[PDB]
Amino acid sequence: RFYSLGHLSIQRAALVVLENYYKDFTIYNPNLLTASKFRAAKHMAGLTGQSRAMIAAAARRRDSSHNELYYEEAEHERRVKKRKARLVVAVEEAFIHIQRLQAEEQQKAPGEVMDPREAAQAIFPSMARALQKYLRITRQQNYHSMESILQHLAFCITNGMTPKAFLERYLSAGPTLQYDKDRWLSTQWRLVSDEAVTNGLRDGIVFVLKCLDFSLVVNVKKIPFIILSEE
Amino acid sequence: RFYSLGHLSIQRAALVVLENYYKDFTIYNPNLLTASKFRAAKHMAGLTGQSRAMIAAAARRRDSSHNELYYEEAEHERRVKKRKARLVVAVEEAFIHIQRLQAEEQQKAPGEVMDPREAAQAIFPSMARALQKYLRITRQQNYHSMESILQHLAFCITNGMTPKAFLERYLSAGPTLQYDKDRWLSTQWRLVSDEAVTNGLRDGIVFVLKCLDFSLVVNVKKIPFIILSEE
């Protein structure tokens, strides 16, 4: 991500970066890191001009080998698309059932809207299997909890949102602030920089914002002297 | 292949099988055998209830591994189709050039048809690269020789055949008799059978026709007693 700041201290710039991180950066997912580590561990489990020649020959031989990553990525994308379509159909059917239940409850009592909580309770099992399958295939089951899903469904029922709005929240990972408060931690943040944090921003300085299992590297650059002429 | 024979000796049945082999069976291609051996040699290079359990677990783990064969076979089929289309286009252009040359030679002298040999000489380089690429991708370069290709082109010019007829000879492997005489050997054939070859055919007897690098196993069965009734 890129941001524009003024004459500020290193600590102030780090705080601005942190506050923009929640609403800008995608939520951190350790599942991708675990998958990458599992993929990389195979090479470790299997195991200076001459060494350079040998590694160059090994790389050349590998370049002619089978491209295992591409086909499995394509299969994963196809499975994700199929499960997304199934989840969309299930959510549409659930919303149809919600509309039918509201219409039925309309005749029972006029001017007395039903509480959405019981409607969410009755409707959730219909799409529960599809939502769980989509979360499993997208590695998003940890963030989305059953109570959170029920609360979001009730909120959508109160607002009368379209099924697409409900679907898109669980479609892809988004900002940190979308999930619950306990998901993010604002206490373990640390600042690492060779220069003192009391000094102002300078061209070429680089600092790091550390936190549990992940760090953000911030590079500071000076805007070039723009020269404008009337043709 | 399946054939129907009468009361014949083992030698006569083997001779009938051999004479039908040339006009029925596809030409033997050792390139596929070499490819299969190269694929199988990787397992050798890499390397009783407990052993059975271990091999069953290994097979189960392999069943969940990547299907390398399918994607590479699909890529090979796509490449073969693309090269086939390119060869078809090249042969069509070559036949157009042949027709143009014949039309040009018509005005030079009436009633004196040109010899097809020089036309084949002039036309072969146009499609030579495409034909060589197709033979390389189909592992058929050994059987089809340059002189044989020229002779086939001259024969087609004399008969005025369509480009499809010329293409289909090199399209896929066919009968043994299509290629040159030196391709097939009718001297190294041998007969292997536990029973004496002088005896007649009997149900359940099996024999082998051996030849250089390849053998044909022949199984003999008796036609079942068919009972027919008028409803």
Ligand SMILES: CC(C)CCC[C@@H](C)[C@H]1CC[C@H]2[C@@H]3CC=C4C[C@@H](OC(=O)CCC(=O)O)CC[C@]4(C)[C@H]3CC[C@]12C
């Ligand atoms: C005759 C009298 C009126 C003279 C008064 C002198 C002031 C104009 C000087 C004396 C002390 C100076 C301050 C001493 C230390 C600091 C901290 C210093 O902090 C930094 O370098 C980090 C912040 C940044 O990046 O600007 C910024 C300048 C400042 C406010 C100075 C601003 C100018 C001050 C007030």
Ligand SMILES: CC(C)CCC[C@@H](C)[C@H]1CC[C@H]2[C@@H]3CC=C4C[C@@H](OC(=O)CCC(=O)O)CC[C@]4(C)[C@H]3CC[C@]12C
């Ligand atoms: C009073 C006179 C007229 C009696 C004559 C007797 C013949 C009717 C017999 C005597 C020798 C026999 C032959 C002896 C040996 C052979 C070889 C034998 O060969 C096999 O078993 C392999 C071929 C096959 O599968 O039939 C077949 C029967 C045959 C021709 C026999 C056929 C019947 C023959 C001519």
